[PDB]
Design a protein around this ligand. Structure first.
Ligand SMILES: [Zn+2]
Ligand SMILES: [Zn+2]
Ligand SMILES: [Zn+2]
Ligand SMILES: [Zn+2]
Ligand SMILES: [Zn+2]
Lengths: 368, 316, 506, 182
């Protein structure tokens, strides 16, 4: 295909850090950009520095009071904000750092600009790895996410696309995006997530939607340790059925790195190729598509995966050897562009997964 | 020149010393560069919208921010106050409890009765029975409502939680022992699959997880009924072979009678046993919470009569 | 066909407590309280495993919104909050009545986190230290570049520099210096450059130590089942485990003669098992030399008689039925376990052979700056030395005692990518097999049953009476409480069928 | 002392306790039937049958005293910690319009039912004479009986998720956090 590939990255995104022990480090995007740069792929992208979002742009989804608190919260004056902190859940789970508002504005501007470029036709493929915050829902900070830039990007895309598809591959369910579009019928949210005594707590097989959004939400409850083959065998038929019976004008893909093996908080058994497989298979359909980088806590694995997915979107395959990036020491033993899956057991069973696909297809029967 | 800069790091070091030689001995054995982006980052702004005194509250008895009194060591929450006080709108003054202010201002041990009788004769014109209570409530601190220890005890299946919340009877690698009875040694046979599916140590993949339902102890396979994981933090898992006990009739709501202590639990048996227009409160073998005895054999006639009626009404 | 239906339902449910709930549900429907959908759903959950009662039930009663579990509905008064950017289209597509709030969906109990080994924790600590160093250095370098540009412009992104200055200037003077800068830049730039130099020196040294710490730990973290394989195998390789497995299989089969089915697609693994067994027998200081020779001879004779492989090729590298007791069955189970593990290692040998031989090394910094041959100095890198044969040699070394288990497991992990962790206990399984053979020959009853097996097998041409007579002759030596096994063997395809007769012969 | 609350009323009270403390629901205020129409309907329906001047006048006195006590004590000891947020919201809105809060005009039939559950406990902490203790208990029991015949019009079984006219309303995550966080 060799689709035109846009790429958004702010050089300052790597200068904002969470708490010392926090599992979120935006610097993962920084070695991802370094890996894409040193592979000689910048000759294959148009690289953009998207304008950061303004208050009114993120007020399209979030409340004005929430935005105002976000724009004024600071680790030095947090004791002046006690009611707001507990009301908006901006406490321990989602803390406050120096560049919180700046980082949120940068991510929102990147997502908005990617959606705008898709709408205008400047490209068929745009990449923004500073997004992926799919947990915050319009009034609160959840899952280390403060602004649901995916919702804003979907809003911008819907201006020119009647139907938009959202796909979540993170082990965490896309609570914020699904909630934002739980009643509308113009947005498909499909989350492949680990369901159980897990952080999202939601995303069960019987959350297809309410009102006009009935049978318009797809949830994939998954057991621990799912490997590349099982994940592909579950992902591909469902995506094909959604493409067949819903026909979105655009698709948005959240490339969360939590599913990767060796993840700090993840529990799946997905490797490098097993994680890039879904991206390549989705790109193989031919509609305008989005990439947002969500989960992922091992910066080396997620950065390598992001670089490989960027290569795959350009119809090229990157080599296993590394181009000697700046942060070379992070890659440890052999410095190869791969992720090793571990040997732990897989609990997913063909009967349970077959039941899941049967229920999902029965729900999807009334989407065309 | 500042020497206090080198305070601490995640390495446990001032970030300026080195590998911390003890750590050395513990942890040892014995296509251009990125400086081209700034000249190629084309700032894109083609957005469509670009043109735009204790540790517990004295009322709720819980933990949180407190506004304690200097004279009364009784910490109070802000919502647990009458009226609630906004923390931003601080009173900024001498604050005392309702009991504290009553005991510190109107503390007239000799003439308290004079005020009591004054209020009593003031309310005597209209409400004499409630005058004493109307006086006394002003002498008490704000409190959180609680049931008076006997509304709760008439239902044995009700217990009070930690912070006063309501609680009921629904509060709660390769492991082959999960398929064993652990009491009789017999394998646990799932109700649906009619198998234990123990698998093997050599091939753990052949094993199918089982739950042993909490209520009726019927073992069920995690793959027989669709369920991603077990139940270990939530409520007691209930098998799908139990009565609904709550029906949303097409809207209208039906509920099963709550359990009552046997001393007050009355029983009665109908003398008809042909057809009874009674609720789901039946027993298989103050007159508001009676438990009817359904006389199981009568159910065979009743269900059959109902389905036959549905058959003939739909026939025409 | 309806009262009989009730009797059939009562028999099939098989529990008074479940039949009581079924009757309660039936009555609840009968009092015009339950609808058809829920009634049929409950009947499907009760008797739906049956296809004759439920199908008639659906066809005799004339059977012929979906709110989510984690979504609440908020009141309309709790909905309208001014959102400035929300246009009419943004108002129509957004949902505001339903919220999830995963605290509600968690039953106020919380969530359960994953279990990670200590190697992963060490990797995470190294990661955290690396990220701290690199973030500080990058932020300081960006501020250095900005100050250099300002200085170059003064010869004649609103908070990064402020954070860097505040971090560098810790005496609370940083605010004053920032204010002076806003209105004194070269001194700040030179202090930042000196701090950058110190931080880069510390980062280089720490990168060193992090690297050799990571080298000894990375492969162990991914060994999830391999770290605990020793104790799990010790617990789950008992006779009770196999008995429970076979009895559960038999019960499942009877809840509807080939309970166990083993296939042997190779004949050269037996030679490797023989070599390992003789190595252990020679090495072990627990049997006398006559006992060692008896072990070896009995093993060779039993294998040659059973599999009909050879009698001299083993020393230079019709349907038969074996009626066996517990001891012989457990010995055979040990043999089959060892054979299956070795076959699993051997089948995929070619791919690891290629991968180890075609193991490319990056020349940018590995072969230029940091060389790691810790497992290559000690020579178990599997360079050449075909992985199956090298693994056999390493197992022989481990049995001999000159190779440690730590290095054996590390080399196995590195050569097989943690896919050969079942070989960590090979020496112990061989020892258990040898002990089982010793017990088999040292007991009079097992020895007599083994002689009966020899007679029946060497007969090799018998009528249908042979099975009954063999079973009776075994039973004469055999007790009335322990269980018998019918080990059927087809020499034509080297497939072994095992049937469990607990006491069904009496 | 010995208050014979009907079993159905005890079940309703425990159901309200479960709905507030466990299901995190609050009463849909202002109530469709607050305290005054229900008490006035009771007074109109019962006092019209009484002929004794003392019995008919003491009923009015009891109704007035019940209204006064409810108005006085709702904000003191008839609200859970969760409903304190709703109380503060109502106070703020009432002060915005300079209207004094009149809780008998907001709460109804479920907070009065919970008002008469600790009356034996409330009278115990007084010097209230025994000869009028029995009168108060008997009047309370008569009112409870009158409510006991008329139950289908004050405690209906309705789902907040299926009808906005239900007596309970779901509390927002923000509402729950603010209510039970400080
Ligand atoms: Zn995630
Ligand atoms: Zn309190
Ligand atoms: Zn006080
Ligand atoms: Zn089952
Ligand atoms: Zn059960």
């Amino acid at each position: 295909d060799k689709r035109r590939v846009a790429y958004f990255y702010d050089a300052d995104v790597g200068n904002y850090a969470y708490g010392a022990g926090h599992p979120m480090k935006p610097h993962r995007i920084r070695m991802a950009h370094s890996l894409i740069m040193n592979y000689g792929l910048y000759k294959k992208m148009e690289i953009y520095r998207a304008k950061p979002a303004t208050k009114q742009e993120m007020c399209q989804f979030h409340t004005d009071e929430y935005i105002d608190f976000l724009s004024r919260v600071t680790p030095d004056n947090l004791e002046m904000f006690k009611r707001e902190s507990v009301k908006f859940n901006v406490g321990d789970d989602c803390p406050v750092f120096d560049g919180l508002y700046e980082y949120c504005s940068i991510s929102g501007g990147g997502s908005m600009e990617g959606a705008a470029r898709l709408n205008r036709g400047k490209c068929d493929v745009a990449v923004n790895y500073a997004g992926g915050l799919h947990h915050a829902k319009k009034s609160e900070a959840s899952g280390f996410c403060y602004l649901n830039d995916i919702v804003l990007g979907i809003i911008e895309l819907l201006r020119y696309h009647p139907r938009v598809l959202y796909i979540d591959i993170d082990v965490h369910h896309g609570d914020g995006v699904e909630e934002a579009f739980y009643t509308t019928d113009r947005v498909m949210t499909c989350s492949f997530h680990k369901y159980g005594e897990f952080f999202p707590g939601t995303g069960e097989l019987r959350d297809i939607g309410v009102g006009a959004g009935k049978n318009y939400a797809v949830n994939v409850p998954l057991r621990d340790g799912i490997d590349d083959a099982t994940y592909r065998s579950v992902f591909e038929p469902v995506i094909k059925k959604i493409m067949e019976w819903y026909q979105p004008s655009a698709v948005v893909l959240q490339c969360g790195g939590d599913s990767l093996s060796g993840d700090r908080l993840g529990c799946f058994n997905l490797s490098m190729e097993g994680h890039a497989n879904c991206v390549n298979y989705v790109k193989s359909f031919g509609i305008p598509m989005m990439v947002v980088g969500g989960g992922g806590y091992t910066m080396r694995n997620v950065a390598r995966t992001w670089c490989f997915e960027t290569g795959l979107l350009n119809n090229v395959v990157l080599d296993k050897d590394l181009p000697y990036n700046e942060y070379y020491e992070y890659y440890g033993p052999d410095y190869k562009l791969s992720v090793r899956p571990s040997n732990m057991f897989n609990v997913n069973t063909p009967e349970y997964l077959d039941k899941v696909m049967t229920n999902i297809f029965a729900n999807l029967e009334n989407t065309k | 020149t500042i020497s206090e800069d080198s305070k601490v790091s995640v390495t446990g070091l001032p970030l300026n010393k080195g590998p911390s030689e003890k750590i050395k001995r513990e942890s040892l054995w014995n296509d251009l560069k990125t400086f081209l982006t700034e000249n190629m980052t084309e700032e894109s702004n083609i957005r469509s919208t670009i043109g735009w005194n204790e540790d517990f509250c004295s009322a709720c008895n819980q933990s949180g921010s407190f506004l304690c009194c200097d004279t009364c060591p009784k910490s109070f929450h802000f919502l647990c106050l009458d009226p609630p006080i906004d923390p931003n709108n601080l009173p900024k003054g001498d604050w005392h409890c309702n009991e504290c202010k009553f005991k510190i201002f109107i503390n007239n041990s000799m003439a308290t009765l004079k005020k009591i009788e004054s209020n009593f004769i003031k309310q005597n014109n209209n409400v004499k029975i409630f005058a004493k209570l109307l006086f006394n409530i002003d002498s008490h601190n704000p409190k959180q409502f609680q049931l008076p220890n006997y509304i709760k005890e008439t239902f044995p299946a009700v217990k009070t939680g930690s912070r006063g919340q309501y609680s009921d009877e629904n509060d709660k690698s390769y492991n082959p022992d999960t398929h064993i009875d652990s009491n009789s040694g017999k394998f646990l046979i799932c109700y649906k699959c009619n198998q234990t599916r123990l698998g093997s140590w050599s091939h753990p993949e052949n094993s199918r997880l089982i739950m042993t339902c909490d209520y009726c102890q019927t073992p069920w396979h995690l793959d027989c009924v669709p369920r991603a994981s077990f139940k270990n933090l939530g409520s007691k898992w209930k098998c799908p072979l139990h009565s609904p006990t709550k029906v949303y009739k097409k809207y209208k709501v039906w509920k099963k009678q709550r359990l009552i202590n046997k001393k007050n639990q009355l029983y009665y048996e109908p003398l008809q046993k042909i057809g009874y227009q009674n609720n789901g409160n039946i027993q298989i073998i103050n007159q508001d919470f009676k438990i009817t005895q359904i006389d199981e054999n009568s159910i065979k006639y009743d269900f059959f009569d109902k389905i036959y009626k549905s058959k003939m009404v739909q026939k025409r | 066909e309806e009262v009989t239906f009730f009797e059939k339902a009562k028999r099939y449910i098989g529990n008074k407590h479940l039949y009581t709930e079924f009757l309660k549900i039936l009555n609840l429907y009968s009092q015009d309280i339950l609808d058809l959908d829920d009634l049929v759903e409950k009947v499907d959950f009760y008797l739906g495993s049956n296809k004759e009662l439920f199908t008639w039930f659906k066809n005799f009663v004339g059977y012929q919104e979906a709110f989510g579990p984690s979504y609440k509905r908020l009141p309309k008064s709790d909905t309208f909050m001014p959102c400035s950017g929300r246009d009419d289209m943004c108002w129509e597509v957004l949902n505001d009545e339903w919220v999830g709030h995963p605290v509600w969906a968690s039953e106020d109990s919380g969530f359960i986190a994953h279990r990670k080994n200590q190697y992963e924790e060490t990797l995470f600590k190294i990661e955290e230290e690396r990220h701290e160093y690199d973030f500080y250095i990058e932020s300081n370098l960006r501020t250095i570049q900005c100050l250099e540009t300002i200085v170059n412009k003064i010869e004649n992104s609103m908070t990064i520099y402020k954070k860097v200055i505040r971090k560098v200037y810790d005496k609370e003077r940083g605010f004053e210096i920032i204010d002076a800068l806003h209105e004194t830049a070269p001194v700040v730039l030179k202090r930042l450059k000196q701090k950058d130099e110190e931080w880069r020196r510390a980062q280089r040294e720490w990168n060193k130590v992090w690297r050799e710490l990571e080298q000894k730990v990375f492969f162990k973290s991914l060994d999830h089942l391999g770290l605990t394989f020793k104790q799990a195998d010790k617990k789950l390789l008992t006779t009770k485990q196999l008995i429970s497995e076979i009895s559960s299989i038999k019960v499942d089969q009877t809840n509807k003669k080939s309970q166990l089915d083993f296939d042997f697609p190779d004949k050269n693994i037996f030679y490797d098992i023989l070599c390992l067994a003789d190595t252990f027998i020679t090495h072990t200081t627990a049997y006398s030399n006559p006992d060692k020779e008896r072990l070896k001879d009995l093993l060779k004779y039993f294998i040659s008689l059973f599999f009909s492989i050879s009698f001299e090729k083993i020393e230079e590298s019709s349907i038969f039925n074996l009626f066996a007791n517990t001891n012989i069955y457990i010995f055979f189970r040990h043999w089959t376990t060892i054979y299956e593990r070795l076959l699993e290692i051997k089948q995929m040998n070619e791919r690891v052979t290629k991968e180890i031989n075609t193991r490319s090394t990056v020349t940018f910094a590995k072969d230029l700056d940091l060389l790691s041959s810790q497992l290559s100095e000690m020579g178990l890198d599997f360079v050449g030395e075909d992985a199956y044969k090298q693994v056999l040699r390493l197992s022989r070394r481990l049995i001999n005692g000159d190779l440690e288990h730590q290095w054996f497991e590390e080399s196995l992990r590195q050569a097989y990518n943690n896919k050969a962790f079942k070989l960590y206990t090979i020496d112990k399984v061989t020892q258990s097999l040898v002990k089982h053979a010793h017990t088999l020959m040292t007991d009079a009853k097992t020895a007599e049953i083994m002689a009966l097996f020899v007679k029946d097998r060497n007969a090799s041409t018998t009528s249908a009476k042979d099975q009954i007579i063999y079973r009776l002759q075994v039973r004469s030596h055999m007790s009335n409480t322990e269980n018998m096994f019918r080990i059927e063997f087809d020499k034509r395809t080297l497939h072994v069928s095992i049937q469990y007769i607990a006491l069904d012969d009496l | 002392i010995s208050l014979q609350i009907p079993i159905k009323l005890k079940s309703v009270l425990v159901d309200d306790w479960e709905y507030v403390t466990k299901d995190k629901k609050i009463c849909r205020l202002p109530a469709d039937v607050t305290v005054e129409m229900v008490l006035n309907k009771y007074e109109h329906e019962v006092s019209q049958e009484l002929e004794s001047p003392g019995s008919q006048s003491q009923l009015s006195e009891y109704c007035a005293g019940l209204k006064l006590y409810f108005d006085k004590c709702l904000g003191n000891m008839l609200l859970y910690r969760l409903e304190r947020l709703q109380y503060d919201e109502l106070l703020k809105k009432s002060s915005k319009d300079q209207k004094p809060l009149v809780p008998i005009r907001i709460y109804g039939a479920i907070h009065l039912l919970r008002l008469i559950s600790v009356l034996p406990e409330l009278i115990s902490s007084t010097t209230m004479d025994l000869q009028s203790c029995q009168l108060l208990i008997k009047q309370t029991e008569d009112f409870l009986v009158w409510l006991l015949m008329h139950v289908d019009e004050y405690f209906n079984d309705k789902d907040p998720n299926r009808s906005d006219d239900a007596l309970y309303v779901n509390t927002s995550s923000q509402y729950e956090g603010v209510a039970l966080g400080m």
